[PDB]
Chains A and B, each alone.
Chain A
Amino acid sequence: SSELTQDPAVSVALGQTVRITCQGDSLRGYYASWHQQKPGQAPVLVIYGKNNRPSGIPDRFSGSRSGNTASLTITGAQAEDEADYYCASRDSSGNHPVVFGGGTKLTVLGQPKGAPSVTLFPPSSEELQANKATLVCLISDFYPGAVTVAWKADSSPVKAGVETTTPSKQSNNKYAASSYLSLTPEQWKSHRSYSCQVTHEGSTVEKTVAPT
């Protein structure tokens, strides 16, 4: 699947310089391109080859070669540079198949922390009129991406019927998560309140909904 070796993850401090390298015996015949991919989007070409760049690519991106190793250097890395970077070239032997690198997750350190935005929704009227009940707890815009989600029935913990995602990066380098609590309309109406507790960097945000 992959033919050129890249480091799966590298880090750089905001404003510093990072060199993402791409190595393989397949490289020696053609120029290496670099593609950038933000979460949820198709790749975007950042280096045609040699040191040529398309429109909309800042000058701080550059390409270089040293035999069987191509390199993408980012001088003065910014927050918008956090993405996955893929080198690509053609095999110099045989029918010249296309050769991809494994990809490199770039992390830019020093970005500002953010407390989670928590939105809790009760089961809708139409869902209850259909004998269903689901509580939706939406967590967004927290950085770093470490967060604990916990549910409460009145004041007691509940674990059955809870489906939680792992945190995933948003397009603005912050993180998002979701937790769904599935109950019967009897379980929903037989309690005074339900709570979604969200802990992030030692601090907790708690939202509460009731059959009102």
Chain B
Amino acid sequence: QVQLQESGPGLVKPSGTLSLTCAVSGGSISSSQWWSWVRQPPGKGLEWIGEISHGVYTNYNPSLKSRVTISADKSQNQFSLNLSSVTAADTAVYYCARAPPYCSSASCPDDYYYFFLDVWGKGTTVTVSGASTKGPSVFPLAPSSKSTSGGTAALGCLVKDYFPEPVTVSWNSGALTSGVHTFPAVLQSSGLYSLSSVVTVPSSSLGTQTYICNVNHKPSNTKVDKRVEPK
């Protein structure tokens, strides 16, 4: 029943300070467990940042200790992370997670010598850049007679020229999950990203049903809901 949700800025200027917050429902951050922060740079592995227990006791990665701060708000069931003097090496997806209690001495039952991360959040993407945020231009990819494959047909949305990542696309407010494929973004020579989301639908139900793609770009605090009508 335990759910975690990170929240952050998405874009941080170099030498700035990154501030994230993980809200917890169905569990208590004031417990003896170790509520942790993990990050994963794009195309790389996981790196451990720190942990906090009972809302007070902290433990950090030795290589990051000089600029990492983890605090907890026991009244809002939240714990937060603060990383100062950021560079491009701090660009990563930041996960909050939960580790179990343990013993530092070799004198405890067997249950207290595990480390595992069984509960994770979805992760929030953070980019360290001096470039400015740009919201996306959403265009409809309307179905035609060449986007058809017999009984089915393809329609989509072009999410063009945005920065930074990520962009999430749902269809009909999440009611339409079958047949949806959101393609990974392309990094263009301008420094801006672009991606496309495409959903496959019955060609007979084109004129009898409305299809809207929901494009969320949190780094710019913009949501675009574009209606897709046949060509």
Partner-B contacts on A (CB < 8 A)? 1-2, 29-31, 33, 35, 42-45, 47-49, 54, 84, 86, 88-90, 94-103, 119-122, 124-127, 134, 136, 138, 140, 163-165, 168, 170, 176, 178, 180, 207-209
Contact = CB atoms under 8 A, between A and B. Distances in A.
A90 B139 contact: no
Given A35-B117, A134-B139, 14 more contacts: A1-B44, A33-B114, A49-B113, A49-B115, A88-B116, A95-B59, A98-B61, A121-B156, A121-B158, A136-B156, A163-B194, A168-B184, A180-B188, A207-B146
A121 B196 CA distance: 11
Nearest to B184: A168
A42 B121 contact: yes
A127 B44 CA distance: 36
Interface of B: 36, 44-48, 51, 59-63, 95, 99, 102, 104, 106, 113-118, 120-123, 139-142, 144, 146-147, 154, 156, 158, 160, 181, 183-186, 188-189, 194-196, 198, 231
Contact of B46 (A54, A96, A103, A119): A103
A165 B186 contact: yes
25 contacts: A30-B102, A31-B114, A31-B115, A33-B115, A35-B46, A43-B120, A88-B115, A90-B102, A94-B62, A96-B104, A97-B62, A100-B45, A100-B46, A100-B48, A103-B45, A103-B46, A121-B141, A124-B140, A124-B141, A125-B142, A136-B158, A163-B188, A165-B183, A178-B184, A178-B196
Contacts of A124: 139-142, 158
B192 to A, nearest CB: 10
Contacts of B189: 163
Contacts of B47: 1-2, 100
Contacts of A94: 62
B147 A119 contact: yes
A103 B41 CA distance: 13
A119 B154 contact: yes
Of the listed residues B36, B114, B122, B194, the one surrounded by the most CB atoms of chain A closer than 10 A to its CB is B114
A151 B139 CA distance: 21
A88 B117 CA distance: 9
B179 to A, nearest CB: 12
Nearest to A43: B120
Contact of A98 (B115, B122, B154, B185): B115
Contacts of B102: 30, 90, 96
Given A43-B120, A86-B46, A49 B114 contact: yes
